[PDB]
Amino acid sequence: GITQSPKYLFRKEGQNVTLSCEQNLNHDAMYWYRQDPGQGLRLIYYSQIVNDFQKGDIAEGYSVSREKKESFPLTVTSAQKNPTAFYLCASSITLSSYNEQFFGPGTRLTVLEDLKNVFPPEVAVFEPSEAEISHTQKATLVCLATGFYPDHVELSWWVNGKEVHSGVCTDPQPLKEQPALNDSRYALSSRLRVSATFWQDPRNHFRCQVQFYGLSENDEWTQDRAKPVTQIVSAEAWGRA
Amino acid sequence: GSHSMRYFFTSVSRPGRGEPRFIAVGYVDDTQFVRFDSDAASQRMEPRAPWIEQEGPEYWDGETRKVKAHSQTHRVDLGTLRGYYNQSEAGSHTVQRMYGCDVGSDWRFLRGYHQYAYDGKDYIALKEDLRSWTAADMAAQTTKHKWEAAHVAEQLRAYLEGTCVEWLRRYLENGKETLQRTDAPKTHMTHHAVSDHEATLRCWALSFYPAEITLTWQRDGEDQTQDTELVETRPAGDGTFQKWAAVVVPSGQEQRYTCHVQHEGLPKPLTLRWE
Amino acid sequence: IMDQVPFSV
Amino acid sequence: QSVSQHNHHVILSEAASLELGCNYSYGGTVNLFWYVQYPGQHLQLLLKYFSGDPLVKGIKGFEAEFIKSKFSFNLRKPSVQWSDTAEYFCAVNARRNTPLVFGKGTRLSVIANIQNPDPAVYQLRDSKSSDKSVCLFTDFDSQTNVSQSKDSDVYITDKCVLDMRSMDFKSNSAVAWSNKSDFACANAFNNSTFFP
Amino acid sequence: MIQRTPKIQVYSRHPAENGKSNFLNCYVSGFHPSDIEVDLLKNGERIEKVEHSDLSFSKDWSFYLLYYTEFTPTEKDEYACRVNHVTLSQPKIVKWDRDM
């Protein structure tokens, strides 16, 4: 299908960033969108076929190329002065009206000025209480990811080696651990509710996994603490009879 | 009777010198009504029949954008096909595409078609069912497999069975005074003696529309083919067509030969005889 | 009118 | 060309009818599309008008009506579900080699139906045995407002709806924690019931 | 690579009548590739203002073109069509016959 740059990414002032977008669907047409909160999808650039691309409605500050059929790289120059933006890549068989567009996962691009306050999250799992088990015959696990910056995380629950979605809800927005500060680190919580019988089985294995998006491997780091690179932080819990 | 709308596209690569030369024309029956030439200065689709002048400016904006999109695809195809056949980058090559739809006397859908040629030979063509393809060689099989996986035949079938027939009916109505008016051929015969024993009889058909016509020579009622010359139907330049059929007959036996003309505009077939 | 943009070979 | 979705935000109770309007300003033949963006997921096609029947059936009980005369493609669903809470985009293409045009989008909020509310506050302890704990306010009805923290040393999350689809059971939940010494789950959600 | 020599027909739009305005036509058809040079000649020299139709092709993918210009036939003037194509080792001259 379609793949693009990681779901999160940041840039510094005066720096240009190129967002990749690729598809092995043999599609001729490819598109770049910017998704603004109140404006919907706004077309930046579109490419009818290889070696041909045309400007959208907000092409100013962006540049693209289409030297290959599979790739449609979008470059965000320094003239683009949006502190944050969500970029969507799409493709279709042709520009024809009959062909619907398939969309990539998207990419959040943040303007990050100081990299010294980038921190990975700490993750802990909190076990259900006996009061809930006796009162409702249900058991709620709570996962908590704390102390990370920026708010570029992806939380998931894993039970006996398989990712679960049922009985799961995650906070739609993280909390500021120091809400009075503009560079506050963030906290995020999630819940996984299972039956009391399931949690009371000691063979059952529960795992909360948080994917953090930080520095790349080729970034410079001259600090005392460990380099806050992109990584996965996890915490686990087993059943209790 | 039956009618048809057809579109013709030609792209000739000019490697090292620029973009391919691109020419596109549209026909309703035997009448051209639109055209595009990449070497023209307008860079726009242009009218060629009086009844298409009734279309508003949004018509010509739409047709101009779509016809340029055709040339863009052919531009890439010339490069793709050059690699399929392991050809050199310095040679000139030609892509041709033709599609359209036919309707019966009731103006209902009769058949559609969409054909593609590389260097003047069949490459790939849509089948009669408008759901499968005919690949002419191994290089075209790659295209066939690609176009089958993308289900592009669905899109073409919706155009050929819907949009194509709908606009053909609209054109036939807006140009009823021209597209539906038949022009019977005006016939005459000439005589030229090639010697004192043989003579050339030429049976003429002038100023007829549509172009379909049949000229046959008969001697004593039976068909004749030997010593008969027939030329291709040719445009007169004013929307009508011309054609003639000649025969070399012995002198004094001209009255044994008859020319038979059949055309839609003729209530009964014409019979021509030299004396 | 003609058809829309065609798929490349 | 433009596409107009008249409702910016729609809040519906469960089992209620959905009616999202869509209108386009292009005056020729078109093809029409509805896209849905569920929270945390990418844009995916819900349904489309290819040709034929103006009433177009889609996935998950959705249906749209293409009216050529009114230039509309209204999306409908007779009985909405909680899982329908997402962003909905209308899209129209004008068949003149111009890219597909999307509307501004409509955010749909489906109020979760809580069948047996049983509000309570429980204390949950860290699985790594670090003496840390969080407070879980759960099983309250959807008309209950969980107010934010009134102290930067205390953290209270917004309410959260999980669905135990095997039991057909939905429940609200909010989490609170603090590194203070005076903090306790008994008075963690007093700003907004069973207490063990 | 398939090559096709053009077929050439030289004729007038209306039956030729001396001293009356008419159109001299030159119809080239059945050729491939499309690159072709066609000139209408009057007494050996090229006619300046000569128009031509838009390139089209037949079912066998061979091209056809119509070149034409207004003229007035007389008794002494001789007209012809000059055609050059990649299939011709030398440009072909076809004189205008009034009965062909």
CB burial of A37-73 (b: ≥16 within 10 Å; e: otherwise) equals eeebbbbbbbbbbbebbeebebbeebebebeebeebb
Place of tokens 């990539």: A104
Report d(CA A184, CA A187) in Å as an integer: 10
B164 is written with which tokens?
Answer: 């194509």
A98 is written with which tokens?
Answer: 């009959």
Q: Is the dihedral of CA D120, D121, D123, D126 positive or negative?
A: positive
**Amino acid identity at E59:** K
Of B65, B68, B152, B154, which to mutate for an interface test with A (greatest number of A Cβ within 10 Å)? B152
D97 touching C (Cβ < 8 Å):
yes
Q: At what angle do helices B57-84 and B138-149 cross, to 10 degrees?
A: 130
Please say whether the beta carbons of E73 and B49 come within 8 A.
no
Report d(CA A140, CA A130) in Å as an integer: 10
Report d(CA E3, CA B14) in Å as an integer: 18
DSSP state of D82: G
Please say whether the beta carbons of A85 and A34 come within 8 A.
yes
Report d(CA E8, CA E26) in Å as an integer: 7
Place of tokens 């005066």: A14
Please say whether the beta carbons of A92 and A27 come within 8 A.
yes
B64 is written with which tokens?
Answer: 């101009």
Method: X-ray
Report d(CA D161, CA D171) in Å as an integer: 6
3-state secondary structure of D161: strand
Q: How far is A30 from chain B (nearest CA, A)?
A: 15
DSSP state of D194: B
* Chain C: touching chains (3 or more CB pairs < 8 Å): A, B, D
B13 is written with which tokens?
Answer: 């690569």
Q: Which of B125, B188, B135, B186 is nearest to B160 (CA)?
A: B125
User: CA triplet B39, B41, B44: central angle to 5 degrees?
Assistant: 90
Please say whether the beta carbons of A105 and A96 come within 8 A.
no
Cross-chain Cβ contact C7/A48 below 8 Å: no
Considering only the beta carbons, identify the residue of D98, D105, D134 that sits closest to A142.
D134
Resolution in A: 2.4
Q: What DSSP element (H or E) covers E40?
A: strand E36-42
Place of tokens 């008075």: D187
Q: Are strands B270-273 and B241-250 parallel, antiparallel or unpaired?
A: unpaired
Q: Is B18 exposed, middle or buried (0-12, 13-18, 19+ CB in 10 A)?
A: exposed
D31 touching A (Cβ < 8 Å):
yes
Q: Which of B49, B44, B12 is nearest to B28 (CA)?
A: B49
DSSP state of E36: E
A54 touching B (Cβ < 8 Å):
no
Q: Is the dihedral of CA B124, B126, B127, B133 positive or negative?
A: positive
DSSP bridge pairs for A55: A45
In chain D, which among 76-105 make CB contacts under 8 A with chain B?
A: 95-98
B6: Cβ–Cβ under 8 A, 6 or more apart, which residues? B26, B27, B98, B99, B100
Q: What DSSP element (H or E) covers D177?
A: strand D169-178
Report d(CA D76, CA B259) in Å as an integer: 70
A95 touching C (Cβ < 8 Å):
yes
Question: Is the bond leading into D117 cis (omega within 30 degrees of zero)?
Answer: no
A abuts D (3+ Cβ pairs < 8 Å): yes
Report d(CA D188, CA B230) in Å as an integer: 103
A232 is written with which tokens?
Answer: 């996965």
Please say whether the beta carbons of A238 and A205 come within 8 A.
yes
B181: Cβ–Cβ under 8 A, 6 or more apart, which residues? B209
> From residue A108, how far is each of A9, A189, A213, B220, D110 by CA, in Å?
6, 21, 11, 89, 27
Q: What DSSP element (H or E) covers D88?
A: strand D86-93
**Amino acid identity at A32:** W
Task: Give DSSP secondary structure letters for chain B.
Answer: --EEEEEEEEEE--TTTSSPEEEEEEEETTEEEEEEETTSSS-S-EE-SGGGGGS-HHHHHHHHHHHHHHHHHHHHHHHHHHHHTT--TTS--EEEEEEEEEE-TTS-EEEEEEEEEETTEEEEEE-TTSS-EEE-SHHHHHHHHHHHHTTHHHHHHHIIIIIHHHHHHHHHHHTHHHHS--B--EEEEEEEESSSSEEEEEEEEEEEBSS--EEEEEETTEEE-TTEEEPPPEE-SSS-EEEEEEEEEETT-GGGEEEEEE-TT-SS-EEEE--
Residue D1: CA atoms inside 13 Å, Cβ hemisphere, count? 25
Q: Which of B238, B263, B247, B259 is nearest to B188 (CA)?
A: B259
Report d(CA A159, CA A136) in Å as an integer: 21
Report d(CA B269, CA B271) in Å as an integer: 7
Q: Are strands D106-111 and D23-24 parallel, antiparallel or unpaired?
A: unpaired
Report d(CA E78, CA E72) in Å as an integer: 11
> From residue E80, how far is each of A75, D120, E12 by CA, in Å?
61, 104, 11
Task: Please report which residue ranges of D61-179 form alpha helices under DSSP H.
Answer: none
B38: Cβ–Cβ under 8 A, 6 or more apart, which residues? B19, B20, B21, B22, B23, B71
A195 touching D (Cβ < 8 Å):
yes
Task: Give DSSP secondary structure letters for B124-191.
Answer: EEE-TTSS-EEE-SHHHHHHHHHHHHTTHHHHHHHIIIIIHHHHHHHHHHHTHHHHS--B--EEEEEE
Breaks (C-N over 2.5 A) in chain A follow: none
Report d(CA A188, CA A148) in Å as an integer: 9
Please say whether the beta carbons of A163 and A157 come within 8 A.
yes
Phi and psi angles of residue A86, each rounded to the nearest 5 degrees, phi first: -115, 120
Report d(CA A73, CA A20) in Å as an integer: 5
D7 is written with which tokens?
Answer: 């409702």
> From residue A190, how far is each of B9, D4, D136 by CA, in Å?
60, 36, 11
Please say whether the beta carbons of B40 and B25 come within 8 A.
no
Number of H helices, E strands in chain E: 0, 9
D108 is written with which tokens?
Answer: 């749909």
Q: Which residues of A touch C9 (CB under 8 A)?
A: none
Q: Which residues of D touch C2 (CB under 8 A)?
A: none
Place of tokens 């030229």: B192
Place of tokens 């030398």: E90
Place of tokens 């006397």: B105
**Amino acid identity at E93:** I
* Chain D: touching chains (3 or more CB pairs < 8 Å): A, B, C
Q: Is B267 exposed, middle or buried (0-12, 13-18, 19+ CB in 10 A)?
A: exposed
Considering only the beta carbons, identify the residue of A26, A51, A95 that sits closest to B69.
A95
> From residue A106, how far is each of A32, A88, A174 by CA, in Å?
10, 5, 19
C-alpha torsion angle, residues D128, D133, D135, D139 (rounded to 10) = 20
DSSP bridge pairs for A127: D125
Place of tokens 């120091």: A178
Please say whether the beta carbons of E80 and E93 come within 8 A.
yes
Of A4, A142, A159, A170, which to mutate for an interface test with D (greatest number of D Cβ within 10 Å)? A142
In chain A, which among 86-125 make CB contacts under 8 A with chain D?
A: 88, 90, 92, 95-98, 100-101, 103-106, 124-125
How far does chain A reach from its first CA to its final CA, in angstroms?
45
Task: Give DSSP secondary structure letters for chain A.
Answer: -EEES-SEEEE-TT--EEE-EEE-S--SEEEEEEEETTTEEEEEEEEEETTEEEE-SS-TTEEE--SSSSB--EEE-TT---SEEEEEEEEESSSSTTSPPEE---EEEEE-S-STT-BPPEEEEEEPPHHHHHHHSEEEEEEEEEEEBSS-EEEEEEETTEEE-TTEEE-SSPEESSTT-TT--EEEEEEEEEEHHHHT-TT-EEEEEEEE--B-TTS---SSSPP-BSEEEEEEEE---
Sheet with E92-95, side-by-side order of all strands:
E45-46, E36-42, E79-85, E92-95
Closest B-chain CA to A52: B72
Report d(CA A135, CA D194) in Å as an integer: 9
Question: Is the bond leading into A150 cis (omega within 30 degrees of zero)?
Answer: yes
Considering only the beta carbons, identify the residue of C1, C6, C9 that sits closest to B163.
C1
Report d(CA D8, CA D149) in Å as an integer: 29
Please say whether the beta carbons of D25 and D92 come within 8 A.
no
B158 touching A (Cβ < 8 Å):
yes
Please say whether the beta carbons of B192 and B244 come within 8 A.
no
Q: Which of B27, B18, B50, B49 is nearest to B167 (CA)?
A: B27
Considering only the beta carbons, identify the residue of B76, B149, B154 that sits closest to A49.
B76
DSSP state of E43: T
Q: Which of B207, B172, B171 is nearest to B188 (CA)?
A: B207
Report d(CA B138, CA B81) in Å as an integer: 12
Q: Which residues of A touch C8 (CB under 8 A)?
A: 28, 49
Report d(CA D120, CA A132) in Å as an integer: 8
Cross-chain Cβ contact C7/B59 below 8 Å: no
E79 touching B (Cβ < 8 Å):
no
